[model samples]
Target: RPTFYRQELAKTIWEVPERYQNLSPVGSGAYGSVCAAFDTKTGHRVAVKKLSRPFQSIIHAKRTYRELRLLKHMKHENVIGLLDVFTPARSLEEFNDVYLVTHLMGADLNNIVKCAKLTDDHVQFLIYQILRGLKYIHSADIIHRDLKPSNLAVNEDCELKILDFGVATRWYRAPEIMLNWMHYNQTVDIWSVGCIMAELLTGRTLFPGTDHIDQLKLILRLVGTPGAELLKKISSESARNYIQSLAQMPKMNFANVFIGANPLAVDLLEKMLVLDSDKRITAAQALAHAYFAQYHDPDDEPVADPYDQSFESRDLLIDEWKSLTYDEVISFVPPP
Candidate 1:
């Protein structure tokens, strides 16, 4: 049986109810709100994520249950731990909303990259942690469909954790769910990881394409065209037909854009962004990639905090700090 938290009503963080105090709002998303709260008993900081509402449909409810179940079994340094679950004192009809309590960590990769350009060593560290987390998830037949910079958190010790599973769409969701295509496995996570790596290295979103059509266009521009033979394997007729409808995509050479990046980085990027899911690189294979090995040592070494040194100033408002564009940020990187 799944564990459930008792419901508490009208208990905003400001109330600082008996067991909770020092409540500070951290972030917000489509599902619910997240806050940093002090646990009086343990005297430890915790992250509290309140769920929006119970699922209206059985399918949605099942997914939520699966996420909770998967998280319960997952134990890894690179993955966030779900410390506790509780329902507030009130209920909206028969179903009560739940709040997930997790350990508190530092800012996300998005915030980190926004503050300054990351060296190749930094990229290696981030990638290694991500791989470590991915390996754990894949071993249990779980897929982190959403693997973006924002979903990854870093602690003061520079340790990384993969957080947030609320919107982890099914594997290969792009064509499968969006286009009603065939079932595919964890390749989507690999694709997202490639994008995340590019974002971390370049301090910019590699493929910030607006929609599916634009996303595919941007992808084809980086990884080259997919052949007709590859389309036939898709389960969705609409997907295969859609692929045939487009003009033959031209071959792309990504090295031109990712200048100064190590060759191994490029190789891994190429392998992960394949149009065909079957051809995409697996997380296990990525762990053995020479690119990660080449830069692993420098990443392991400790470095000065970017915020403490020179980045923090009166002129550096949080918004301005977060707004630093990719190109502006990348200019500060020391060449590898």
Candidate 2:
């Protein structure tokens, strides 16, 4: 008892439910292609993502399954809401793809950062939302890990929502990730937040590196060389030795790096971009920084129960992952 509409898109085919209409391509990426469509039943526009080769490999299947679970678990206003999940196939035997429906946003923060001439007020409000969202995310023991301008969505009213819960992009990547640090916590996300805030403040990348080594060098040039104590903690001996080999450089003055930027904003970035992951500011701590004093509201910032990360530990095959994902999709009930 279901109806579907099939349309051939630029690089893929979409066979979404009939309730979603007026489909048009939004963009395409390695994971999937997105299209904006009007939801007839809800009377709102939604971005529908058709996952490509979701079950092609064990790695892809695991990612697809994880994204579905995380998106469904999230419930913050600053986080994109998953509206619907569907598949053309009615039976498990025929299931091969997945479609995720989320709120339609006009443009990503990347476009805004590049073209828009934002005021100080705009910058503060936007950063507040990012921190607010991060607070919620960290509360669940999850790291966005992939926070970047392109992964953030903003509408005309300046409402922002975090999107694409996956990779640690090279530019926004944290020092620990690049150094192949053995263990990671939520502080990894704080590093990206700092990179993003810097970009928003200055309208350019703070650490634009040509490669992994170059990336580390750019970060060290600005954040300066880490103390020997900090370098010793790096799990990789080669990485530790590499830092030791470089000539010691002192941390640069924040004011000099971001000239004319708000003193408080610069201070927050300084704490966020610390070379030592242990000393980096937490999301909740960042939200409480004086930079966001005027807009900070404890009552509005709610936390969630910690997420169950047991699935990642399991060694499941592609078929097993596919079955679990299919089960979740079938359990979803469309809005009346």
Encode model 1's per-residue lDDT on 1-336: one tens digit a residue: 122233333454322235655666676542246778887768989877765433544444444444554455556778876676554333223233445667887788767888888888888878877877787777666667777766788977678998773612322133433444547588778877887887777777776656666655666566655576686676677666676544246656788868888777888888876777888888777877887785344333332112221332234332233223111222222111
What residue pairs are clashing in model 2?
Answer: none
Q: Candidate 2 at residue 330, lDDT? A: 80
Model 1 vs. true fold: TM: 0.74
Alpha-carbon error at 116 in model 1, in Å?
A: 2.1
TM-score of each: 0.74, 0.93
Model 2, span 1-336: residue lDDT tens: 469978898857889889999998865552248888998988999989888789999999999999888877888989887899989997999999899998887788877877775777788899899999999988988888888887888998889998883423889999777766769889998899899888888887888888877777778877777787787677777877787554244555667878888888889989999888899999898888899989898899999777887998999999999999999898876444
The Cα local distance difference test for each model comes to 0.62, 0.84
Q: Model 1's lDDT to the true fold? A: 0.62
Candidate 1 clashing pairs? 5-86, 5-87, 6-87, 7-87, 7-88, 7-89, 8-88, 8-89, 9-89
What are the clash counts of all predictions, listed in order?
9, 0
**N/CA/C clash count, model 1:** 9
